[PDB]
Design a binder for this molecule. Sequence first.
Ligand SMILES: Nc1ncnc2c1ncn2[C@@H]1O[C@H](COP(=O)(O)OP(=O)(O)OP(=O)(O)O)[C@@H](O)[C@H]1O
Ligand SMILES: Nc1ncnc2c1ncn2[C@@H]1O[C@H](COP(=O)(O)OP(=O)(O)O)[C@@H](O)[C@H]1O
Ligand SMILES: [Mg+2]
Ligand SMILES: [Mg+2]
Lengths: 470, 487, 128, 53
Amino acid sequence: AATGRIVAVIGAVVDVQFDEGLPPILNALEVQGRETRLVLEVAQHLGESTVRTIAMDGTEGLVRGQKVLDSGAPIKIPVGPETLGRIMNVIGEPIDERGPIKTKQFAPIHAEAPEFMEMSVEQEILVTGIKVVDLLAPYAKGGKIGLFGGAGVGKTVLIMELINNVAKAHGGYSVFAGVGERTREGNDLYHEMIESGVINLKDATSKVALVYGQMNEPPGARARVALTGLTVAEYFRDQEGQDVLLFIDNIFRFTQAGSEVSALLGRIPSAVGYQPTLATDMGTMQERITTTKKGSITSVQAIYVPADDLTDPAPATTFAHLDATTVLSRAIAELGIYPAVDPLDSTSRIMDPNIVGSEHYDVARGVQKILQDYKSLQDIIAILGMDELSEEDKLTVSRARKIQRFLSQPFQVAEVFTGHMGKLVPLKETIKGFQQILAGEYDHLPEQAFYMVGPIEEAVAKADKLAEEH
Amino acid sequence: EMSSILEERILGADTSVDLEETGRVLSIGDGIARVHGLRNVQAEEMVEFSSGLKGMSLNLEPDNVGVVVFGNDKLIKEGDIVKRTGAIVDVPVGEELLGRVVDALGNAIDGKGPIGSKTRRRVGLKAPGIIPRISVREPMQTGIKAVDSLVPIGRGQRELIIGDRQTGKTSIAIDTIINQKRFNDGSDEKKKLYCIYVAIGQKRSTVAQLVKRLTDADAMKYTIVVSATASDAAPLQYLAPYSGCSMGEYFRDNGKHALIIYDDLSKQAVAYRQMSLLLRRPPGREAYPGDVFYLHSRLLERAAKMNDAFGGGSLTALPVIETQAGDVSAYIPTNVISITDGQIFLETELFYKGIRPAINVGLSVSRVGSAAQTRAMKQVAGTMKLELAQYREVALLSRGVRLTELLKQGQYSPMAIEEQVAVIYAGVRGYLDKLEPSKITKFENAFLSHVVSQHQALLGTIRADGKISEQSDAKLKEIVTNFLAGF
Amino acid sequence: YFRDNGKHALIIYDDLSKQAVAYRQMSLLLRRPPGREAYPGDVFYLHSRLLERAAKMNDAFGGGSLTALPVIETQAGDVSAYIPTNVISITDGQIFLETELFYKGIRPAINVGLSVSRVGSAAQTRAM
Amino acid sequence: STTSEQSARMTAMDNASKNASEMIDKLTLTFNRTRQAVITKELIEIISGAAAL
Ligand SMILES: Nc1ncnc2c1ncn2[C@@H]1O[C@H](COP(=O)(O)OP(=O)(O)OP(=O)(O)O)[C@@H](O)[C@H]1O
Ligand SMILES: Nc1ncnc2c1ncn2[C@@H]1O[C@H](COP(=O)(O)OP(=O)(O)O)[C@@H](O)[C@H]1O
Ligand SMILES: [Mg+2]
Ligand SMILES: [Mg+2]
């Protein structure tokens, strides 16, 4: 096809001048004369038969005038069941040293979002075994979830506990896309999925496909790897009808990489410093991760929050794309409460009495009401002390602290930190325990009897142990 | 000496002349040189200016080349000739650097002559992928009781040392470097740790005194010091961490174990912000460029632990971050917390209250942690951590006070793992619950001297086995009880 | 003119905030690079080289003087805004006026806890 | 009881003033942080507006 010449190299932004046969936007171009395959994705047409492109790998060693070849199609990755148990990078090459991925078809990573007449409405609660999640913000089968959190508050531990519970109990070809995360964590996940039998290195019956572009990758790879994993999941949903799980961690890195290349594309910076096209990029990417009438994609996404802002344009823009947000807090994690989910900031769309039932709904609303009352009291509690509160106020503070402690839970993936064995509290135990703590059936137990327990039976047992030993 | 000049300095003197490719400086300013020419120069290739300076070809543009000047742009004028070197920016690596102080480009600044390096390695290489790595298992001993017990560090890890100014971060790194002497002198060559100390934006006098502290402890013989101090150009303070990281990747790739300290990364982010703002790039939060996260993450991602098919080496990174007023929710602190595998929070309240090292045990964490402890240290430190959590909950109480005073340590005093285990054992079994607190340190001192002067056999058994067996358990029990009766 | 001829003058600028605003507009329209709150770089210079001409000449030069009473209008009592910062760092003291003390019947509404005069007591009369 | 109430009141008001000053210090830290961020944001607005000409 068409051949052109590099005319400018600035970071990950390469300008390529074609003499004839200009390539459409979003096409893939192969730089000629390199040891490893370097792919440039067309982003703009500058005129003068020049295009501007974003490089999917490093641009060092590139010389002005180097040959570039046009592929005639966007980045195409192999899609199919043969991707299960394999690791592939942003451009579909296997990075697990197990040979080529011999699939029958390749899909472009740029596609159109499903139409409005394909949207599905069904809303069925997805039980995760986590107390605060299943009580205050239940997830939904086939709904986008999203886990917001600052730096080091429990995003990856929570996403791995969700992986364990849901993905292991599942039967529908999970997919994991590591976007701008630690390569160490990717190796850990690969090997803990090899040992658990979810990835089968021989006699291939795997049920998870991994796609990884990590912190070490240039901005173009970190900006398109989410689309690559998204494409794998879209294949599993549409052309098989399967019920896919899709885990994305971390998806703020997509916006951040767009912001890193936006300056070099010559665009006036928006607010904060992000690209002017933040919301529409997030929309074109996030509207493809969706359940249709053809298949179901349960999408859990970790979302980094820069400097613990939550009003930074990237988290603020992500909020509108999710059905059940779970917001972790640093102030809570400094109290020792894990998972550090903020009870008064995590929402859900199925938190509706006509879906979860009046029992669940009323218990959740009461828990949130008592926690809100405690928060509003906290200021004069810490100024004057509790000795000045009303007796009803002392009761609301007591029950609120107890509910705080009961919301925490030891995680199976956190035995290395908690020392306790991981508990998986089913839904009715959660509802009943919290209903009882609300009613006042435990006004005599010490508050530390609820910290890091399973169901309320373990709380009463821990209280008995504390009372007898001490 | 006279013939030390005609040595070969004249005969072998590179007095060649070759057909070189050149460019001409159009405009020097803001530490960036717009250069005309260099048609075949590569992106990120090192060029050499007329004054003997060096630069990196950052912006290949249609009509000019933007060159980042590694030095003072005072020595560059418009019209200067700029030669290609054909080599993407790289630094000398090898074992010939151990004992040498160098600047960010690999040039010796210790006056001991040239580094006899035979290998060069690029500063901007890519970190290893997913397959070359393997989980952290081997302990990286610091010699500090608090760190080695509660916040263990393995080989191949990234552990942030974060805290305000003058809270003992450099002291922790220097003790970690001094502690590796007991391993580097031993026989097992899979426990030797070669240390690297990159000093960025620091006072040059402080770096000289650091090299002195390392030479007095005879730790320079296995330590590289890369120095890009406060008066050096911002591009040099930008490059220094990657130079040090390549010097450490040399050991990581050849089946050896390196440790690297970046002191600190906040100053490298400040230098990169200077360069970015002088390049008219859009400033984000706190005027930092959009890719300061990438700046630190492509660097701290090269600290890996290879598997036994890729050599089995490692590279441990201890990046340092200085917070303002104890704010950890700032931009760059949270960036590096997002990159690393844990933190060591040093506090000003603890440091001012005589608790040194002022490690906040409740906030310090090590995501890898347990997988890289010895068995004996694990045995005693599990109970110690449980009791410390109990004590901070109620802030038993006397046990907690006893333990926290047992965690104090002196500067330039890294303890072997056996002696830390002995002290923590004497603290965690209760054997000074009734000794009033202020004598504890004294007791500790005396106690350990006892255990090292007379019971060397028990310590040797702990060293050989790695665990404190039931036999050694009762042995240490009678030792500590007999001493306490004597004390 | 009066200072250099043995006489004594007293000049009031009412106020310097609006002079700084006029200069900011002028320079912004001359395309000069803006700084904090779009003030130019030398806007400090602007006032200092103005407020430094107020001096007390020794008797070898005539013995005259020129006293300056520049006025500054803060916003919500913010005295570390850019222009108040500059003019506070330039002058030899300040006389703080407060709305809250204005309405408490304290008139002139001089907040004495904040009002400063570094060369004050040396000028005061012996009786006072 | 009169005695043994003025004492309790004195110590309680001591605790109140101490806690109030602790909150004052922490809120002052946050205030300085916020005002620096505000200055930065307005400067970046002015600069990005000047760069579009
Ligand atoms: N473990 C310790 N025990 C006792 N004193 C200590 C200890 N560590 C440091 N100090 C003392 O406190 C001082 C702190 O110096 P240090 O360089 O270690 O802190 P820092 O975090 O690096 O501060 P800076 O930003 O200035 O480099 C040391 O000079 C030393 O005198
Ligand atoms: N469910 C939990 N129980 C106990 N500790 C936890 C839990 N989740 C997180 N943590 C602690 O918080 C730290 C940060 O965890 P992680 O999720 O990996 O950080 P990040 O926010 O970058 O994803 C962990 O190292 C762990 O010590
Ligand atoms: Mg994460
Ligand atoms: Mg230091």
